[model samples]
Target: MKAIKLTGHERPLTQVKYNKEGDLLFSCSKDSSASVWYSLNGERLGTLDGHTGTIWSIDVDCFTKYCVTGSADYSIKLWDVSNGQCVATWKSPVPVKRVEFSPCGNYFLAILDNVMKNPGSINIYEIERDSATHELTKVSEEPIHKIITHEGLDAATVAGWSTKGKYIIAGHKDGKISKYDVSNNYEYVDSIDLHEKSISDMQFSPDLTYFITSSRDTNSFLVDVSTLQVLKKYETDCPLNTAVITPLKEFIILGGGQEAKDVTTTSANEGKFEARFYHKIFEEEIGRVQGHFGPLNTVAISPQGTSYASGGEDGFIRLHHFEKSYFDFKYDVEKAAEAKEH
Candidate 1:
């Protein structure tokens, strides 16, 4: 396990994401900017600097040609990835927490907060090519699908779309998960309470058969999609901010740490601010990496399963790569063990 660190943000990074091709990585930070990088070599591509306030979330499209960002400035912006230019912006009443693109890149979702402390809402917009302008535009002054609340909770923290784009799952501050069937007029299909505290992050498996969730309650959960049943639960010492299933489906990577203001308790609270890797099948923690000086906020794995990137409150993104020799040695070990069993 070797890593190369990329430094640029002046403040903590809020989230890190990889494009579908795994050739590009996007990271947003509290520094009020987002940066792009070539995933293979850690080359700095360019910076997306249109946001006036801290960036909270970012996502790239299926083609890796365009990206979207949500910021504390209470707005969302679309960027042209090829040139690193802002194409459009939409002002909101409150800060946008998260943004995501549909699998086919025909639609995108913006989860907006309610300034009055009421329940938040999910806004779904269609990606259209303007006839006159001949440019990509998010159509509709109003969302085609507006989800008001999930189980009475107004604050939605995170959300994800299923692989086939048939369903959408959203997590709320109250630990409630609302499943919406997008194929059927965006009807609310089900709801489940999976955490004791606010759901920090949720992501689906590579196969989309299951989903993993992390919460501020210091726990992570693996749930079966078909039944929405809790398949497994892993507990940690500190609040879990993000949990991602590796592309290889071999391990679950979790990132988190103590609160920012509680820095004095570092001595009494060891291993609370590192990336913990757990075995996928056994749920046993296999390794821990102290890659960041502060709490890790997000971790994203490449689609090719060759490397992963971790963003921390220390304002750096560490990209880790596995040596080819490591994979070859593991393959040899498995084959040798198979011969003995036969």
Candidate 2:
């Protein structure tokens, strides 16, 4: 199928996100660069051109003014997406993986990559903004809370904050789910085994009381944050790279495919390059959309849940906006330019 494919990254895409307004889209790849685009149409706006290694994780705030990125270049950066200027950079001894903003948008967590000898940690920092405009200023040099996961040494692959940003929940390299409470210095509260393979992605529900997790084990699960127990599970033929809960509908989106050292975006079918939809409560695969030439690295649905976007290992990002009749929903600019005979 045809999609609004966007290209900028020299290597495969690693992650993608939309701001709270759903008007801005940010994408990162194995390359040092990350880009922002106008989501109404696939128009590349600017690139966050710092960082020399792969940009593994990225996020945008509700207002789209503040953005954050984590790079294996051993740095975490905060950028102003509007102008492509990086305001702050933090140096780390090891590569940073996933850098996520808190629910309040005032705090963010930077996950340092774990090597064989040293155990990685999740560092939380409070972001400073303008007093009146709420414009991002600079990030603090020190982390307000730091959690060093001692049990697994298995390392946390994915993590996020709880409902009110009260608790910290994370999935590990060993497929274990652990919870840390801010009330106790981010101390370990509880943990449970959820998958046999490493947990790949964890996304909270609209209410933030629960979330769904996807993994390399070819399983996606719905779990309760309070009990850390699985409520439902969805299975597929291939490993899932990302999973998310869609608003306004009781459905879930999953994406991924097998990875190979010699693979490229030559053709898509063999790579399993399609986004899957599962019935939220039934755990059945209901629909699928295919396009990318390689496994999907990330998939995101609009805040309104009327549209979605996917980035793949092929180094291309595809944008899809749902239409009931097939051709009515398009950007206003395109509509005006197409019928300009008068």
Candidate 3:
């Protein structure tokens, strides 16, 4: 399917993810609704609705057996995907802005955001031995420092765990990407301020050769891990929230940034907001799909790039799949363009 629209909530949709099989997709909307869906037919499997505020993020277990959802309501819920039941609900005073299961699926990390003076921290929860109970206990009681308060921007969102989860790279509110040694005082090893705007989302390349960051500045920056030099840079008309390298292709998939408009919510109202899908080939844009009625916020690709999912402020989540043949055509065209330039 080229595109399929899923809508049911009243506010903007914020995040989306796919299960291991690429058959099931999950979404969280600003209206506080979290949902699961079937990728092929655009069918709504079920909605996990319990949070009182906007739902920020969600993650499914590695086994795809259970789902965890985080919210602006300052709580996280564990859902039994098979039964569509809210199994466990955990609360915090500040909003939990982002959530993800560790690469190994041993621990769940939740970001307790908006702590005012103190830098926000990540909470790690270890899933218990019993999968049926859907229980998790805080392995680390204190909020681990995701930042050292050097002012990487107070509202930035981070992504990706190093190959072994020994290191973490975070995207800053100011659009700087910081590499931290998680085990060593969360020391700041290096940082690249590639974006002139806030980095809403980022991800590590599947092979760990590079990490990608997208900003509200209408740009996506790709950095080679070894050199940390920006190997590729591409610009877009719409601000991008999340960016990830494709497993099935060399290009990157650009995800959400709601319509650029007067953001009355903040004092630093920059400019108008618009959203679109930009297909990049070797740091150059070749295609775009623009019909999202609201700003796109977060986008996720399956471990394999054969499928992708995104959420936006319009209270809708859309799922997309890569037709192998289509990507082949894209590759050919991009190659042709390069050969012509040479």
What lDDT does the true structure give each of the candidates?
0.83, 0.84, 0.69
Q: Write the per-residue lDDT of candidate 1 for residues 303-334, one digit (tens) a residue.
A: 88888899988888999887775354334445
Candidate 1 stretches greater than 4 Å from native? 129-138, 260-272, 324-342
How many steric overlaps are in each model, in order? 2, 0, 16
Model 3, range 1-342, lDDT digits (tens) per residue?
266777766777777788877788888777777778887776889888788888888888778777888887878888878888886777777788778776667666676675756576566666664555544443344443444445545544665566666666667667787676667866668877788887887777776667778887888877876557887787777667777776766767776555546745443443223233344445666455454555667677777677776666666666676675646756566678868986
Q: State the weakest 10-residue window (summed lDDT) of model 3.
A: 269-278
How high is the lDDT of residue 186 in model 2?
Answer: 87
TM-score of 3: 0.81
Model 2 weakest lDDT span, ten residues long: 325-334
lDDT of 2 by residue, 130-221 (tens): 87777867667888877886575478888998888888889899988889988788889888887889999998887789989999899999
By descending TM-score, how would the candidates be arranged? 1, 2, 3
- Per-candidate TM vs. native? 0.90, 0.90, 0.81
Better of 2 and 3 by lDDT: 2
Off by over 4 Å in 3: 130-156, 183-186, 256-281, 330-342
Give me the runs in candidate 2 sitting further than 4 Å from their true place: 136-138, 260-272, 325-342
